[PDB]
Design a protein around this ligand. Structure first.
Ligand code: HEM
Ligand code: HEM
Lengths: 145, 145
Protein backbone atom coordinates (compact mmCIF):
# COMPACT_ATOMS: atom_id res chain seq x y z
CA UNK A 1 0.00 0.00 0.00
CA UNK A 2 1.37 3.38 -1.09
CA UNK A 3 -0.44 4.95 1.86
CA UNK A 4 1.15 2.61 4.40
CA UNK A 5 4.53 3.23 2.79
CA UNK A 6 4.01 6.99 3.01
CA UNK A 7 3.21 6.57 6.70
CA UNK A 8 6.76 5.30 7.20
CA UNK A 9 8.10 8.80 6.51
CA UNK A 10 8.46 9.84 10.14
CA UNK A 11 9.66 13.19 11.46
CA UNK A 12 13.29 12.02 11.63
CA UNK A 13 13.22 10.49 8.15
CA UNK A 14 11.72 13.68 6.71
CA UNK A 15 14.42 15.86 8.32
CA UNK A 16 17.19 13.63 6.98
CA UNK A 17 15.67 13.79 3.51
CA UNK A 18 15.48 17.59 3.62
CA UNK A 19 18.94 18.08 5.09
CA UNK A 20 20.63 15.87 2.49
CA UNK A 21 18.51 17.26 -0.35
CA UNK A 22 19.74 20.77 0.43
CA UNK A 23 23.15 19.50 -0.68
CA UNK A 24 22.57 17.08 -3.57
CA UNK A 25 19.67 19.11 -4.92
CA UNK A 26 21.86 22.19 -5.34
CA UNK A 27 23.52 20.71 -8.44
CA UNK A 28 20.75 18.93 -10.33
CA UNK A 29 22.67 18.59 -13.60
CA UNK A 30 25.86 17.26 -12.01
CA UNK A 31 24.30 14.91 -9.45
CA UNK A 32 21.48 13.89 -11.78
CA UNK A 33 23.88 12.66 -14.46
CA UNK A 34 26.06 11.09 -11.77
CA UNK A 35 23.11 9.07 -10.51
CA UNK A 36 22.23 7.85 -14.02
CA UNK A 37 25.76 6.95 -15.11
CA UNK A 38 26.24 5.06 -11.85
CA UNK A 39 23.02 3.15 -12.49
CA UNK A 40 24.23 2.17 -15.96
CA UNK A 41 27.68 1.22 -14.68
CA UNK A 42 26.50 -0.83 -11.71
CA UNK A 43 23.46 -2.32 -13.45
CA UNK A 44 24.28 -2.82 -17.11
CA UNK A 45 21.11 -4.89 -17.60
CA UNK A 46 18.97 -1.75 -17.29
CA UNK A 47 20.57 0.16 -20.18
CA UNK A 48 18.17 -1.45 -22.65
CA UNK A 49 15.22 0.44 -21.14
CA UNK A 50 16.85 3.78 -22.01
CA UNK A 51 16.99 3.20 -25.77
CA UNK A 52 15.60 6.67 -26.54
CA UNK A 53 18.53 8.44 -24.84
CA UNK A 54 21.03 7.00 -27.30
CA UNK A 55 24.63 6.36 -26.27
CA UNK A 56 24.45 6.80 -22.49
CA UNK A 57 28.16 6.09 -22.09
CA UNK A 58 28.76 9.63 -23.34
CA UNK A 59 27.43 10.94 -20.04
CA UNK A 60 27.23 14.73 -19.74
CA UNK A 61 28.02 15.12 -23.45
CA UNK A 62 24.75 13.35 -24.33
CA UNK A 63 22.07 16.06 -24.57
CA UNK A 64 19.15 13.64 -24.16
CA UNK A 65 20.72 12.07 -21.08
CA UNK A 66 21.40 15.49 -19.57
CA UNK A 67 17.83 16.64 -20.20
CA UNK A 68 16.48 13.41 -18.73
CA UNK A 69 18.79 13.63 -15.70
CA UNK A 70 17.93 17.23 -14.83
CA UNK A 71 14.23 16.41 -15.10
CA UNK A 72 14.64 13.37 -12.86
CA UNK A 73 16.03 15.65 -10.15
CA UNK A 74 12.93 17.85 -10.34
CA UNK A 75 10.85 14.74 -9.70
CA UNK A 76 12.78 14.28 -6.46
CA UNK A 77 12.40 17.99 -5.68
CA UNK A 78 8.66 17.45 -6.18
CA UNK A 79 8.60 14.58 -3.68
CA UNK A 80 10.54 16.58 -1.09
CA UNK A 81 8.16 19.52 -1.40
CA UNK A 82 5.18 17.21 -0.81
CA UNK A 83 6.49 15.67 2.43
CA UNK A 84 4.22 17.93 4.50
CA UNK A 85 1.04 16.54 2.92
CA UNK A 86 0.78 12.74 2.41
CA UNK A 87 -2.25 13.01 0.11
CA UNK A 88 -0.30 15.24 -2.28
CA UNK A 89 2.83 13.12 -2.00
CA UNK A 90 0.81 10.04 -2.96
CA UNK A 91 -0.79 11.61 -6.02
CA UNK A 92 2.53 12.81 -7.48
CA UNK A 93 4.11 9.44 -6.69
CA UNK A 94 1.37 7.61 -8.55
CA UNK A 95 1.80 10.00 -11.49
CA UNK A 96 5.46 9.05 -11.85
CA UNK A 97 4.67 5.40 -11.12
CA UNK A 98 2.55 5.36 -14.27
CA UNK A 99 5.50 6.74 -16.23
CA UNK A 100 7.43 3.62 -15.25
CA UNK A 101 4.59 1.10 -15.35
CA UNK A 102 4.16 1.90 -19.04
CA UNK A 103 7.88 1.27 -19.48
CA UNK A 104 7.48 -2.15 -17.86
CA UNK A 105 9.58 -1.26 -14.82
CA UNK A 106 8.87 -3.45 -11.79
CA UNK A 107 9.21 -2.48 -8.13
CA UNK A 108 12.31 -4.67 -7.89
CA UNK A 109 14.05 -3.01 -10.83
CA UNK A 110 13.03 0.48 -9.71
CA UNK A 111 14.77 -0.33 -6.44
CA UNK A 112 18.07 -0.65 -8.28
CA UNK A 113 18.31 3.13 -7.96
CA UNK A 114 19.10 2.75 -4.25
CA UNK A 115 22.68 1.76 -4.99
CA UNK A 116 23.36 4.88 -7.11
CA UNK A 117 21.69 7.15 -4.53
CA UNK A 118 23.81 5.66 -1.72
CA UNK A 119 26.98 6.28 -3.74
CA UNK A 120 26.09 9.84 -4.73
CA UNK A 121 25.22 10.62 -1.12
CA UNK A 122 28.47 9.05 0.10
CA UNK A 123 30.47 11.23 -2.29
CA UNK A 124 29.06 14.27 -0.48
CA UNK A 125 29.81 12.79 2.95
CA UNK A 126 26.30 11.56 3.76
CA UNK A 127 26.40 8.01 5.11
CA UNK A 128 24.13 4.99 5.50
CA UNK A 129 21.77 6.92 7.78
CA UNK A 130 20.84 9.16 4.85
CA UNK A 131 20.91 6.39 2.26
CA UNK A 132 18.35 4.49 4.34
CA UNK A 133 16.13 7.57 4.60
CA UNK A 134 16.08 7.85 0.82
CA UNK A 135 15.40 4.13 0.50
CA UNK A 136 12.16 4.73 2.41
CA UNK A 137 11.10 7.45 -0.03
CA UNK A 138 11.93 5.21 -2.98
CA UNK A 139 9.87 2.50 -1.26
CA UNK A 140 6.80 4.72 -1.59
CA UNK A 141 7.16 4.68 -5.37
CA UNK A 142 7.85 0.93 -5.32
CA UNK A 143 4.53 0.38 -3.54
CA UNK A 144 2.78 1.99 -6.51
CA UNK A 145 4.45 -0.15 -9.19
CA UNK B 1 16.01 26.39 -34.09
CA UNK B 2 15.07 25.87 -30.45
CA UNK B 3 18.47 27.27 -29.48
CA UNK B 4 17.71 30.39 -31.52
CA UNK B 5 14.40 30.87 -29.72
CA UNK B 6 16.11 30.28 -26.38
CA UNK B 7 19.15 32.50 -27.04
CA UNK B 8 16.72 35.28 -27.90
CA UNK B 9 15.23 35.57 -24.38
CA UNK B 10 16.57 38.93 -23.19
CA UNK B 11 17.62 40.06 -19.70
CA UNK B 12 14.39 42.02 -19.28
CA UNK B 13 12.24 39.08 -20.37
CA UNK B 14 14.06 36.74 -17.99
CA UNK B 15 13.60 39.32 -15.23
CA UNK B 16 9.83 39.45 -15.77
CA UNK B 17 9.63 35.65 -15.95
CA UNK B 18 11.49 35.18 -12.69
CA UNK B 19 9.64 37.99 -10.87
CA UNK B 20 6.23 36.58 -11.80
CA UNK B 21 7.28 32.98 -11.13
CA UNK B 22 8.28 33.94 -7.59
CA UNK B 23 4.56 34.46 -7.02
CA UNK B 24 2.64 32.01 -9.21
CA UNK B 25 5.29 29.37 -8.59
CA UNK B 26 4.87 29.68 -4.82
CA UNK B 27 1.57 27.75 -4.82
CA UNK B 28 2.11 25.02 -7.39
CA UNK B 29 -0.91 22.95 -6.38
CA UNK B 30 -3.34 25.85 -6.43
CA UNK B 31 -2.07 27.64 -9.53
CA UNK B 32 -1.34 24.44 -11.41
CA UNK B 33 -4.90 23.17 -11.03
CA UNK B 34 -6.21 26.65 -11.83
CA UNK B 35 -4.22 26.63 -15.07
CA UNK B 36 -5.55 23.22 -16.11
CA UNK B 37 -9.18 23.92 -15.20
CA UNK B 38 -9.01 27.19 -17.15
CA UNK B 39 -7.65 25.34 -20.18
CA UNK B 40 -10.59 22.94 -20.03
CA UNK B 41 -13.09 25.74 -19.50
CA UNK B 42 -11.91 27.90 -22.40
CA UNK B 43 -10.80 25.09 -24.74
CA UNK B 44 -13.24 22.24 -24.21
CA UNK B 45 -11.88 20.55 -27.34
CA UNK B 46 -8.74 19.58 -25.41
CA UNK B 47 -10.54 17.60 -22.69
CA UNK B 48 -10.40 14.41 -24.76
CA UNK B 49 -6.59 14.45 -24.70
CA UNK B 50 -6.58 14.08 -20.91
CA UNK B 51 -8.79 11.00 -20.61
CA UNK B 52 -6.17 9.29 -18.41
CA UNK B 53 -6.95 11.84 -15.71
CA UNK B 54 -10.59 10.78 -15.49
CA UNK B 55 -13.30 13.37 -14.81
CA UNK B 56 -11.38 16.65 -14.90
CA UNK B 57 -14.46 18.59 -13.79
CA UNK B 58 -13.76 17.29 -10.29
CA UNK B 59 -10.94 19.81 -9.99
CA UNK B 60 -8.80 19.62 -6.86
CA UNK B 61 -10.68 16.52 -5.66
CA UNK B 62 -9.39 14.55 -8.67
CA UNK B 63 -6.12 13.04 -7.43
CA UNK B 64 -4.87 12.28 -10.95
CA UNK B 65 -5.53 15.85 -12.09
CA UNK B 66 -3.91 17.22 -8.94
CA UNK B 67 -0.82 15.05 -9.43
CA UNK B 68 -0.58 16.08 -13.07
CA UNK B 69 -1.06 19.77 -12.29
CA UNK B 70 1.60 19.86 -9.58
CA UNK B 71 4.06 18.06 -11.85
CA UNK B 72 3.36 20.47 -14.70
CA UNK B 73 4.41 23.34 -12.43
CA UNK B 74 7.75 21.62 -11.81
CA UNK B 75 8.34 21.49 -15.57
CA UNK B 76 7.96 25.27 -15.55
CA UNK B 77 10.19 25.48 -12.48
CA UNK B 78 12.73 23.50 -14.51
CA UNK B 79 12.49 25.97 -17.41
CA UNK B 80 12.87 29.00 -15.13
CA UNK B 81 15.95 27.55 -13.43
CA UNK B 82 17.66 26.96 -16.79
CA UNK B 83 17.08 30.46 -18.21
CA UNK B 84 20.72 31.54 -17.97
CA UNK B 85 22.16 28.54 -19.82
CA UNK B 86 20.48 28.11 -23.25
CA UNK B 87 22.22 24.75 -23.70
CA UNK B 88 20.53 23.33 -20.60
CA UNK B 89 17.21 25.03 -21.34
CA UNK B 90 17.19 23.50 -24.81
CA UNK B 91 17.80 19.93 -23.66
CA UNK B 92 15.01 20.06 -21.05
CA UNK B 93 12.65 21.76 -23.51
CA UNK B 94 13.27 19.03 -26.09
CA UNK B 95 12.64 16.41 -23.39
CA UNK B 96 9.19 17.79 -22.63
CA UNK B 97 8.57 18.37 -26.33
CA UNK B 98 8.82 14.61 -26.85
CA UNK B 99 6.20 14.06 -24.14
CA UNK B 100 3.78 16.07 -26.26
CA UNK B 101 4.92 14.98 -29.72
CA UNK B 102 4.03 11.42 -28.75
CA UNK B 103 0.52 12.63 -27.88
CA UNK B 104 0.15 14.36 -31.25
CA UNK B 105 0.14 17.87 -29.77
CA UNK B 106 1.02 20.43 -32.45
CA UNK B 107 2.85 23.71 -31.90
CA UNK B 108 -0.41 25.56 -32.50
CA UNK B 109 -2.30 23.43 -29.96
CA UNK B 110 0.47 23.79 -27.37
CA UNK B 111 0.05 27.54 -27.72
CA UNK B 112 -3.48 27.26 -26.31
CA UNK B 113 -1.83 27.34 -22.88
CA UNK B 114 -1.13 31.07 -23.28
CA UNK B 115 -4.73 32.01 -22.54
CA UNK B 116 -4.76 30.15 -19.19
CA UNK B 117 -1.33 31.52 -18.24
CA UNK B 118 -2.46 35.09 -18.96
CA UNK B 119 -5.52 34.62 -16.74
CA UNK B 120 -3.58 33.06 -13.86
CA UNK B 121 -1.01 35.85 -14.08
CA UNK B 122 -3.80 38.44 -14.08
CA UNK B 123 -5.30 36.88 -10.95
CA UNK B 124 -2.11 37.98 -9.21
CA UNK B 125 -2.09 41.35 -10.97
CA UNK B 126 0.67 40.62 -13.48
CA UNK B 127 -0.35 42.42 -16.66
CA UNK B 128 0.18 42.07 -20.42
CA UNK B 129 3.92 42.72 -20.19
CA UNK B 130 4.23 39.53 -18.11
CA UNK B 131 1.84 37.54 -20.30
CA UNK B 132 3.98 38.50 -23.29
CA UNK B 133 7.12 37.35 -21.49
CA UNK B 134 5.57 33.94 -20.82
CA UNK B 135 4.37 33.66 -24.42
CA UNK B 136 8.03 33.98 -25.43
CA UNK B 137 9.02 31.08 -23.18
CA UNK B 138 6.13 28.98 -24.51
CA UNK B 139 7.39 29.86 -28.00
CA UNK B 140 10.68 28.13 -27.18
CA UNK B 141 8.79 24.87 -26.71
CA UNK B 142 6.76 25.52 -29.86
CA UNK B 143 10.04 25.74 -31.77
CA UNK B 144 10.55 22.09 -30.82
CA UNK B 145 7.09 20.94 -31.92
C1 HEM C 1 14.56 7.93 -7.79
C2 HEM C 1 14.06 7.10 -8.86
C3 HEM C 1 13.60 7.51 -10.12
C4 HEM C 1 12.93 8.66 -10.46
C5 HEM C 1 12.57 9.82 -9.54
C6 HEM C 1 12.60 8.56 -11.85
C7 HEM C 1 12.03 9.61 -12.61
C8 HEM C 1 11.81 9.59 -13.98
C9 HEM C 1 11.19 10.66 -14.75
C10 HEM C 1 10.70 12.01 -14.22
C11 HEM C 1 11.09 10.20 -16.02
C12 HEM C 1 10.45 10.89 -17.22
C13 HEM C 1 9.02 10.42 -17.44
C14 HEM C 1 8.53 10.69 -18.85
O1 HEM C 1 8.67 11.83 -19.32
O2 HEM C 1 7.99 9.75 -19.48
C15 HEM C 1 11.66 8.87 -16.06
C16 HEM C 1 11.76 8.07 -17.21
C17 HEM C 1 12.20 6.75 -17.26
N1 HEM C 1 12.62 6.02 -16.15
FE1 HEM C 1 12.81 6.68 -14.26
N2 HEM C 1 13.03 7.35 -12.38
C18 HEM C 1 13.67 6.70 -11.33
C19 HEM C 1 14.26 5.43 -11.41
C20 HEM C 1 14.24 4.60 -12.53
C21 HEM C 1 14.84 3.27 -12.59
C22 HEM C 1 15.62 2.61 -11.45
C23 HEM C 1 14.59 2.76 -13.85
C24 HEM C 1 15.05 1.58 -14.44
C25 HEM C 1 15.53 0.38 -13.81
C26 HEM C 1 13.82 3.79 -14.55
C27 HEM C 1 13.40 3.69 -15.88
C28 HEM C 1 12.88 4.75 -16.64
C29 HEM C 1 12.67 4.70 -18.08
C30 HEM C 1 12.92 3.52 -19.00
C31 HEM C 1 12.25 5.93 -18.46
C32 HEM C 1 11.99 6.38 -19.89
C33 HEM C 1 13.14 7.19 -20.46
C34 HEM C 1 12.84 7.74 -21.84
O3 HEM C 1 12.68 6.94 -22.78
O4 HEM C 1 12.77 8.98 -21.98
N3 HEM C 1 13.65 4.92 -13.75
N4 HEM C 1 12.08 8.49 -14.80
C1 HEM D 1 3.06 25.42 -20.12
C2 HEM D 1 2.80 24.34 -21.04
C3 HEM D 1 2.77 22.98 -20.74
C4 HEM D 1 3.65 22.27 -19.97
C5 HEM D 1 4.87 22.84 -19.25
C6 HEM D 1 3.23 20.88 -20.02
C7 HEM D 1 3.79 19.86 -19.25
C8 HEM D 1 3.35 18.53 -19.20
C9 HEM D 1 3.97 17.48 -18.41
C10 HEM D 1 5.15 17.62 -17.45
C11 HEM D 1 3.31 16.33 -18.71
C12 HEM D 1 3.60 14.92 -18.24
C13 HEM D 1 4.40 14.14 -19.28
C14 HEM D 1 4.35 12.65 -19.05
O1 HEM D 1 4.58 12.22 -17.89
O2 HEM D 1 4.09 11.91 -20.02
C15 HEM D 1 2.26 16.67 -19.66
C16 HEM D 1 1.37 15.73 -20.22
C17 HEM D 1 0.43 16.02 -21.21
N1 HEM D 1 0.27 17.26 -21.80
FE1 HEM D 1 1.19 18.99 -21.32
N2 HEM D 1 2.13 20.71 -20.85
C18 HEM D 1 1.82 21.99 -21.29
C19 HEM D 1 0.80 22.31 -22.20
C20 HEM D 1 -0.05 21.38 -22.81
C21 HEM D 1 -1.10 21.71 -23.76
C22 HEM D 1 -1.48 23.13 -24.18
C23 HEM D 1 -1.67 20.53 -24.17
C24 HEM D 1 -2.75 20.29 -25.05
C25 HEM D 1 -3.42 21.24 -25.90
C26 HEM D 1 -0.96 19.47 -23.46
C27 HEM D 1 -1.26 18.10 -23.56
C28 HEM D 1 -0.71 17.08 -22.77
C29 HEM D 1 -1.21 15.71 -22.72
C30 HEM D 1 -2.38 15.14 -23.51
C31 HEM D 1 -0.52 15.07 -21.77
C32 HEM D 1 -0.74 13.62 -21.33
C33 HEM D 1 -1.50 13.56 -20.02
C34 HEM D 1 -1.58 12.16 -19.45
O3 HEM D 1 -2.22 11.29 -20.08
O4 HEM D 1 -0.99 11.93 -18.38
N3 HEM D 1 0.01 20.00 -22.62
N4 HEM D 1 2.31 18.01 -19.97
Amino acid sequence: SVYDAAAQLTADVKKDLRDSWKVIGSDKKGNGVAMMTTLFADNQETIGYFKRLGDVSQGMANDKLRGHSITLMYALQNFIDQLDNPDDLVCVVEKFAVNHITRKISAAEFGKINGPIKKVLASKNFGDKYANAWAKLVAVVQAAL
